[PDB]
Design a protein around this nucleic acid. Structure first.
Ligand SMILES: [K+]
Ligand SMILES: [K+]
Ligand SMILES: [K+]
Ligand SMILES: [K+]
Ligand SMILES: [K+]
Ligand SMILES: [Mg+2]
Ligand SMILES: [Mg+2]
Ligand SMILES: [Mg+2]
Ligand SMILES: [Mg+2]
Ligand SMILES: [Mg+2]
Ligand SMILES: [Mg+2]
Ligand SMILES: [Mg+2]
Ligand SMILES: [Mg+2]
Ligand SMILES: [Mg+2]
Ligand SMILES: [Mg+2]
Ligand SMILES: [Mg+2]
Ligand SMILES: [Mg+2]
Ligand SMILES: [Mg+2]
Ligand SMILES: [Mg+2]
Ligand SMILES: [Mg+2]
Ligand SMILES: [Mg+2]
Ligand SMILES: [Mg+2]
Ligand SMILES: [Mg+2]
Ligand SMILES: [Mg+2]
Ligand SMILES: [Mg+2]
Ligand SMILES: [Mg+2]
Ligand SMILES: [Mg+2]
Ligand SMILES: [Mg+2]
Ligand SMILES: [Mg+2]
Ligand SMILES: [Mg+2]
Ligand SMILES: [Mg+2]
Lengths: 46, 124, 181, 238, 394, 333, 101
RNA sequence: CUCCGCAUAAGCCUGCGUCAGAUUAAAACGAACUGACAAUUAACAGCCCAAUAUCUACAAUCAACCAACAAGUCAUUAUUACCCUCACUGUCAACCCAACACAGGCAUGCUCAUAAGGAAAGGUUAAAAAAAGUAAAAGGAACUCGGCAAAUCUUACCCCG
RNA sequence: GCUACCUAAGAACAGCUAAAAGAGCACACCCGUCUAUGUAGCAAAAUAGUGGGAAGAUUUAUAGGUAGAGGCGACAAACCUA
RNA sequence: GCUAAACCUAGCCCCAAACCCACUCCACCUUACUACCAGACAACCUUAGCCAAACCAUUUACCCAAAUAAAGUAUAGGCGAUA
């Protein structure tokens, strides 16, 4: 029916899906963190 | 939809997240069955406050105190002030030996001491 | 007791309160360790009193009688800490030769950056620590490109700074001809 | 993925063990078998298929009293709890096995045959020719694997040159050694194949997800295939 | 045979070792000096590490065979949790006793006098049942763990309210958290009963002997029944690290040493957890025998002989609705043999205090059918309980 | 939302706050008074119970100090109460038919005072101050008859009830919302509805040594008084509401009760008489009645326990326990 | 102390002692009605109630009976130039009850 | 009027408390806008539990009769080790997900019509067309693709599944 | 974090007839047959009336898993952040 | 007459020269920025396509260590495009 509310907040889910440990577990996430550091993002991970 | 810029504190998240996070206070004990906390007196820091009766020093210094040269304390200066007189005296008297530096004040190993310079096992 | 958190009742409400100078590094070196300890506690009491007065002034929307006293106390305490640290460092250098009181090492991180890793106190050996072993202190051969890109970015920043400085010098010389000599 | 098998217990016990459903997913999280998922919660009860398992500090033939015969969710047959000496075990109950009976497990092979008393376990060589058996083992000490389902039974067709020729429920001939221990009689729940599901929800209760709605055109594999009986499967190694 | 435990769940094997160690005379270069792991350098071999100082929270016990009280001979321990398979028959075989149905005539006749009856017996027992099953707590339906001990305590208090009629009832107390241990032999098998929990009636007057020397001697004709092919030591904790001691539950000088009656409860809220009546009766018999044997060994020494003075111990085992009564008379300490003088056990089994209790009214077709309260109340069970309580005093 | 009033509390000066919350005035000493007994036998029984719980019973576990309370003192109190009531049943016939409850819940819910909500959408609205007491006395005695009144219903005292100068939240006292219970230890259908005597055991958290270390030396009697007042007020109010009296229908007769607080070694005795339930502001604007709580200072029952001997047994404390148990309801003509 | 590495403790061992503490407190006027024997302080996060009690009993010689601490959170709602949130620092509010009336 | 309301969980993070200003509220004083100053105090929850061997067949449904199948959340023992105590974190609000002060979405416990929570009308007049309702002479489907809508709360069938 | 399917441990289902129900009437609750309104709307799918189910193949809270030459699907070429 | 209009700096771009970064204290790979317990998880492996050949299927330039010249020469290629 009505859409737009696909984001149901959940801190545990957010930290597990997007987090420092999750990024550093795999080499791809390390590359993502490296790209964010190179660009200069204030927030590198959720 | 979450503020990534804000600092992640113990006030955010579910009950487990809020309870597993602290503000930086050092632990003074441990948990046991029944979620029962046992406190360790030795782990609890003990303040050392001296007696301030008859202490002539005051928080401020009068502006009439003359200016003095600034000389930061160095290892060589400390050795000259403390160990050099005794070493020179023993050398002149002939009693000097290269095996009693510990007698002169040297510490071979910090192990076995309550206060160890390296690694520092004592608080300020 | 709780009276020490407040200034003298006669001095309460005064617009200005007289104060002396702050203890200097040489003056504090001239004193013994026990004297430094007692003076540190006295300065701590004075600093607590001044912080209480400042907070109450902010609460009552009135100017502090003498803000400079807090700065003087802070400077004196910093000088005392500096003197004590100098004595401790000299004694450590004499007895053991180590510069720092906390063991550390130069480690390459997972991102290829060389950092100073300060050791922590543990009970189990280093190899038996699961959480410590989970940490990576090496960079696989996919960070070299990012390191090169960061180096090039820093070089660009430095070149921009130098060129801007040269342009400013040229503009200054143009405005003031006599600076050529 | 993070898939840890629930089959982690290494010690036998009669206590029911909680089992985790798979839903047809393998350790990679992919659907490897379709039509599996859901169903009623079940606990697994370990079954000792090695009928001749003498307890420690003992040897030779023994006998066990059947304490109980009851239902098992993990299999179509019934499970008999029995006790021998100081050891209590679960086995597969035969067609006629109730409380108070005394089953006999033996490994003795003689020139004469045996009475073949229902649930008793005897070697194939000891068992008489043309006898109904169940829970046979391919190799000595391997454990019963080839007759387990409810109402299934094989027949000892032949005993030639120290080898036993049996007829599996699929009517295929299987040759094994004569020292393989087998249990006489038929397995319990003879009328298992006569059950009626009744409603589409009973399959869901048994954890059988419905088939896909896609229409697949039948090919050359379909149609009746009259084929000769496969050759005898022999595990006797020369 | 089938082996339990799949290799995926089993611990993974370590990775193969590098060949620098295999090569002789060559010192491997590892990351042991770097204090962290690097893929290129070889994996060091770490020597075993001992903590040195004893940390209670991180203590690892020595191997089982290195314990001081380790014996190759196996002792079969029976505790409160143990549930016998055969039940009463196995308990009789282990305890070397003969079973007699029905309570002793003396105990039954102790309450035949209407004077010994409690005033308003039926009303008081109904009030006790209603209080335990419905009025105990704020919950609509109190659970068994709540209403079984309450029932037992209220019945004990109601029986104890007869001190005016019998002054001897003031010479007894009730003790909780009392543990006793006894050890004996049966066909060269070492058995040990460790009874813990429950309520122990502690008195200073020993119970009179229920039976007579004529019956004690006539018990020789009785032969214990076997249950082949089931070993008598089945469903008992077989242990190798054990100690053999004869403890009566209290130190010397206790004012109330004699165990009069032991109250056992089956209060688990789950039917699988609750013991069967046969298992509960077997547990009662074993606990009574253990208490009697401990008292006999304390009084007459550790020697094996025929007790000139038999030891009488009573037991009441209940589940909140069903009761079982036992009077056990120990007559001998020579238990190794299967023949000779045997103990006695008068057992009354499966006495229902009530049939069912309705915590809420039953309404069918808008008409009340079953009012709240006990259904099928039987005062004979309470009369037998009162007789057991008053035994040795009235 | 309601304040959870804890009888055994770590709060400081909580006795005055509880007096304000219950409209109770505290008096010192005992209320004025309106076959042969063997004191030697009673002392022997008490010593036997104490020695059984301390020395005679062979513990199978290394009893720690934290466990010591539940290991020793609670069974000791239960067994002592049981033996004493059994021995005093001949002297007091009411104890024979009395019901002895071991660790049963006691609840009471009452409203006193009003507040103005400071913030939220409910700002500037009158909200009643609600309180809930959830107590589990170790041992209590219930009967079907009510004990005689200590003082008349209109009795007055010169001592004024203390008034708190701030909110109850500074006690500290916290608010929570859950089911409101009014319980006497049993449901309304129980014939034994009135109370005779309660027995309370202080927890390890409120022990004398810990209070001395925390500099709460003067707070021991405060804790005793607070626990006694809260428990007895809850019991009396629950009994009154079971009889049918509430804020708008105040009690026509006083409801009396007795409490014995103990820490295993020290005992204190309290008597409470509920004279009013109109604690709400509307019904208390013109209510002159005051609840009264009589109390006694804590005294040691014994000095030390050495081997098979008890040192310094307190016959006065034993006799006070005996008198509390021997108090009996009046008999009508 | 603050911003220091506490030595690790093992069973037995010596007592952790601090000689020159750097914990600075300030006695603040309560914003709401408080009991007479109640004093309110503002302290850093790294200071516990036990540490505050020892601090008061050793430095100022104030008898202390009970200490209750809470963490007060500063407002981050304010937006400065460039629409960037400015974080008001958080602190710890401590309530101390005098131990001798 | 009461669709609710109160509390917890989840979520957000100071977001109608005081003072000094009144930008601003889909009008407007209110204040939710600006600055400064206060605050939420643990008993309620989170944060737990030494080792090696070993034990655990008997459902819940008031669990008592029967009655089943889909076969079921809710246990130990033996030995060794173990004197020591009340730390830390959450506690505010008119609040979350939908670009909004959005008629949408939102899990539980209690209340079952309220003891708690709110206001459909800025003022006037009563044109057309439009929307939601009420009532209607006589006829009662003659309307229409079709009894669509509304009212009363029928009978007998056919095709497909 | 929506949704398709699955895994682990949880929760809810008033009342009436019959009780043996993938049974009937009928609230919470789920879904969405028909009509009207709205069509830059209150809403990038809603409101009112009227409807189907409502002890089961039901609804639902939390955590985890299946990732695009794919997943998943009681096949609608469905769903996989409008 | 409002709304408005106008500005000259901040700085940036291309070269040249020169091979740049690194730790007051504390915290930071677990839910990063979290004082403090029994692990063993460790890296390596042809790029493919768009496009051109007027479709497309073989094929289609992509700095690899000296500017220029040899030289778009030899040579390769559905001997076509082109290399
Ligand atoms: K089956
Ligand atoms: K918010
Ligand atoms: K037509
Ligand atoms: K909407
Ligand atoms: K093309
Ligand atoms: Mg969105
Ligand atoms: Mg969801
Ligand atoms: Mg199956
Ligand atoms: Mg099919
Ligand atoms: Mg099909
Ligand atoms: Mg707190
Ligand atoms: Mg708690
Ligand atoms: Mg709140
Ligand atoms: Mg929903
Ligand atoms: Mg209202
Ligand atoms: Mg309007
Ligand atoms: Mg208008
Ligand atoms: Mg009409
Ligand atoms: Mg027509
Ligand atoms: Mg018609
Ligand atoms: Mg027409
Ligand atoms: Mg219609
Ligand atoms: Mg159909
Ligand atoms: Mg499941
Ligand atoms: Mg229903
Ligand atoms: Mg149905
Ligand atoms: Mg229906
Ligand atoms: Mg189709
Ligand atoms: Mg199609
Ligand atoms: Mg082309
Ligand atoms: Mg084309």
């Amino acid at each position: 029916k009505a859409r737009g509310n696909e984001y149901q907040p959940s801190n545990i889910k957010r930290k597990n899906k997007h987090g420092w440990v999750r990024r550093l577990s795999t080499p791809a996430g390390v590359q993502v963190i490296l790209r964010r550091m190179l660009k200069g993002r204030k927030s590198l991970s959720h | 939809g979450a503020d990534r810029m804000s600092k992640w504190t113990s006030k955010r998240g579910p009950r487990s997240f809020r309870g597993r996070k602290g503000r930086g206070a050092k632990g003074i004990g441990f948990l046991t069955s029944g979620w029962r906390f046992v406190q360790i007196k030795e782990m609890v820091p003990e303040f050392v406050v001296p007696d301030l009766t008859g202490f002539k020093l005051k928080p401020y210094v009068s502006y009439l105190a003359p200016e003095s040269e600034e000389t930061p304390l160095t290892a060589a200066q400390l050795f000259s002030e403390a160990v050099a007189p005794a070493i020179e005296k023993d050398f002149k008297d002939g009693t000097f030996d290269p095996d009693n530096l510990e007698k002169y004040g040297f510490e071979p190993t910090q192990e076995g001491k309550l206060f160890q310079l390296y690694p520092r096992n004592f608080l300020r | 007791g709780l009276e020490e958190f407040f200034d003298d009742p006669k001095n309460w409400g005064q617009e200005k309160v007289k104060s002396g100078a702050a203890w200097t590094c040489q003056q504090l070196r001239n004193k013994s360790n026990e004297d430094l300890h007692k003076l540190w506690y006295v300065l701590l009491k004075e600093r607590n009193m001044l912080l209480t007065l400042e907070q109450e002034a902010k609460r009552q929307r009135l100017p502090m009688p003498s803000p400079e006293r807090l700065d003087k106390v802070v400077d004196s305490m910093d000088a005392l800490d500096k003197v004590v640290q100098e004595r401790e460092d000299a004694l450590r250098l004499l007895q053991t030769g180590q510069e720092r009181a906390r063991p550390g090492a130069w480690r390459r991180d997972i991102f290829g950056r060389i950092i100073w890793h300060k050791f922590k106190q543990w009970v189990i050996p280093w190899h038996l620590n699961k959480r410590y072993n989970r940490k990576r202190f090496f960079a696989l051969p996919y960070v070299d490109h990012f390191l090169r890109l960061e180096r090039e970015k820093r070089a660009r920043i430095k070149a921009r700074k130098e060129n801007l400085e040269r342009k400013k010098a040229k503009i200054l010389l143009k405005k003031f001809p006599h600076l050529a000599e | 993925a993070n898939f840890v098998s629930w089959k982690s217990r290494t010690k036998y016990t009669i206590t029911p063990v909680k089992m985790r459903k798979s839903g047809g997913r393998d350790h990679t999280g992919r659907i490897r078998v379709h039509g599996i998922g859901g169903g009623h919660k079940q606990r697994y009860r370990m079954i000792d298929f090695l009928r001749f398992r003498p307890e420690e500090t003992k040897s030779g033939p023994f006998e066990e009293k059947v304490i109980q015969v009851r239902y098992d969710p993990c299999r179509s047959a019934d499970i008999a709890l029995v006790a021998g000496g100081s050891r209590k075990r679960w086995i597969i109950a035969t067609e006629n096995m109730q409380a108070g009976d005394t089953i006999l497990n033996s490994n003795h092979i003689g020139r004469m045959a045996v009475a073949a008393r229902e649930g008793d376990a005897h070697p194939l060589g000891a068992l008489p020719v043309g006898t109904l058996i169940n829970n046979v083992e391919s190799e000595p000490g391997r454990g019963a694997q080839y007759i387990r389902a409810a109402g299934t039974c094989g027949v000892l067709l032949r005993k030639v040159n120290g080898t036993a020729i049996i007829q599996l429920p699929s009517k295929r001939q299987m040759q094994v050694l004569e020292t393989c221990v087998a249990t006489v009689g038929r397995v319990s729940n003879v009328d298992h194949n006569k059950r009626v599901i009744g409603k589409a929800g009973r399959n869901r209760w048994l954890g059988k997800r419905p088939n896909s709605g896609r229409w697949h055109r039948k090919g050359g594999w379909a149609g009746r295939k009259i084929r000769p009986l496969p050759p005898m499967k022999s595990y006797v190694k020369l | 045979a089938y082996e339990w435990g799949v290799r995926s769940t089993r611990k993974s094997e370590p990775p193969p070792l590098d060949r620098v160690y295999e090569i002789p005379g060559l010192e491997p270069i590892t990351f042991a000096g770097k204090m962290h792991f690097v893929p290129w350098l070889a994996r060091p071999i770490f020597p075993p590490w001992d903590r040195g100082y004893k940390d209670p929270r991180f203590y690892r016990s020595p191997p089982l065979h290195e314990h001081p009280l380790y014996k190759d001979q196996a002792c079969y321990i029976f505790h409160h949790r143990c549930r016998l398979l055969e039940g009463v028959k196995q308990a009789l075989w282990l305890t070397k006793t003969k079973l007699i149905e029905g309570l002793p005539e003396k105990v039954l006749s102790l309450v035949d006098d209407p004077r010994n009856h409690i005033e308003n017996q039926d009303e008081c027992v109904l009030n006790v049942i209603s209080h335990a099953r419905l009025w105990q707590t704020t919950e609509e339906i109190p659970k068994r763990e709540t209403y079984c001990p309450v029932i037992v305590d209220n019945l004990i208090q109601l029986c104890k309210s007869q001190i005016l009629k019998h002054p001897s009832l003031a010479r007894r107390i009730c003790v909780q958290n009392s543990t006793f241990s006894a050890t004996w032999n049966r066909e060269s098998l070492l058995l040990q009963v460790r009874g813990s929990g429950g309520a122990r009636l502690s008195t200073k007057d020993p119970l009179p002997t229920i039976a007579s020397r004529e019956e004690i001697e006539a018990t020789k004709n009785h032969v214990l029944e076997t249950f082949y092919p089931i070993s008598p030591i089945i469903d008992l904790h077989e242990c190798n690290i054990y100690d053999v001691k004869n403890d009566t539950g209290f130190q010397e000088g206790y004012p109330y040493p004699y165990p009069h009656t032991l109250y056992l409860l089956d209060k688990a809220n789950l039917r699988p957890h609750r013991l069967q009546p046969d298992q509960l009766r077997a547990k009662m018999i074993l606990f009574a025998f253990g208490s009697a044997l401990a008292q006999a060994r304390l009084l007459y020494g550790n020697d094996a002989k025929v007790l000139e003075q038999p030891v009488v111990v009573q037991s009441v085992g209940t589940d909140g609705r069903v009761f079982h009564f036992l009077v056990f008379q120990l007559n001998t300490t020579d238990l190794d043999c299967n023949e000779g003088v045997k103990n006695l056990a008068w057992v009354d089994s499966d006495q229902l205090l009530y049939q069912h209790f309705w915590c809420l009214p039953v309404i069918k077709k808008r008409v009340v059918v079953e009012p709240v309260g006990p259904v099928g109340f039987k005062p004979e069970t309470f009369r037998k309980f009162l007789a057991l309580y008053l035994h040795g005093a009235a | 939302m309601k304040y959870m009033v804890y009888p055994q509390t770590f709060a400081l000066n909580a006795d005055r706050w509880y007096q304000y919350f219950t409209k109770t005035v505290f008096l010192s000493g005992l209320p004025p008074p309106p076959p042969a007994l063997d004191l030697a036998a009673l002392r022997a029984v008490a010593c036997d119970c104490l020695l059984q719980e301390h020395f005679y019973l062979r513990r199978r576990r290394r009893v720690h100090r934290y466990e010591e309370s539940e290991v020793i003192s609670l069974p000791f109190l239960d067994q002592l109460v049981s033996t004493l009531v059994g021995l005093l049943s001949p002297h007091n016939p009411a104890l024979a038919a009395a019901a002895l409850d071991y660790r049963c819940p006691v609840h009471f819910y009452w409203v006193r005072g009003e507040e103005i909500i400071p913030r939220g959408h409910r700002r500037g609205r009158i909200d009643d101050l609600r309180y809930q007491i959830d107590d589990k006395p170790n041992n209590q005695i219930r009967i079907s008859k009510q004990l005689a009144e200590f003082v008349p219903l209109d009795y007055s005292v010169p001592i004024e009830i203390p008034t708190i100068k701030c909110k109850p939240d500074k006690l500290p006292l916290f608010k929570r919302q859950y089911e409101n219970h009014i319980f006497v230890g049993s449901k309304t259908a129980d014939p034994c509805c009135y109370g005779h005597t309660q027995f309370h055991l202080l927890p390890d958290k409120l022990r004398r040594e810990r209070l001395l270390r925390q500099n709460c030396a003067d707070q021991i009697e405060v804790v005793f008084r607070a626990n006694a007042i809260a428990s007895l007020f809850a019991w009396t109010g629950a009994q009154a509401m079971y009889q049918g009296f509430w804020s708008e229908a105040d009690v026509t007769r006083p409801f009396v009760s007795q409490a014995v607080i103990t820490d295993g070694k020290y005992f204190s005795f309290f008597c409470y008489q509920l004279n009013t339930l109109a604690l709400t502001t509307q019904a208390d604007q013109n209510n002159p009645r005051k609840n009264i709580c009589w109390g006694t200072q804590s005294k040691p029952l014994y000095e030390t326990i050495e081997d098979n001997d008890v040192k310094g047994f307190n016959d006065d404390v034993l006799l006070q326990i005996v008198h509390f148990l021997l108090n009996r309801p009046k008999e009508e003509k | 102390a603050r911003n220091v590495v506490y030595p690790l403790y093992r069973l037995g061992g010596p007592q952790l002692r601090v000689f020159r503490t750097n914990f600075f407190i300030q006695l603040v006027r309560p914003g709401v009605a408080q009991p007479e024997d109640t004093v309110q302080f503002r302290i850093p996060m790294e200071m516990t109630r036990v540490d505050l009690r020892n601090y008061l009993e050793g430095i100022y010689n104030v008898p202390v009976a009970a200490v209750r601490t809470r963490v007060q959170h500063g407002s981050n709602k304010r937006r400065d130039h460039r629409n960037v949130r400015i974080k008001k620092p958080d602190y710890k509010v401590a309530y101390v009850q005098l131990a001798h009336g």
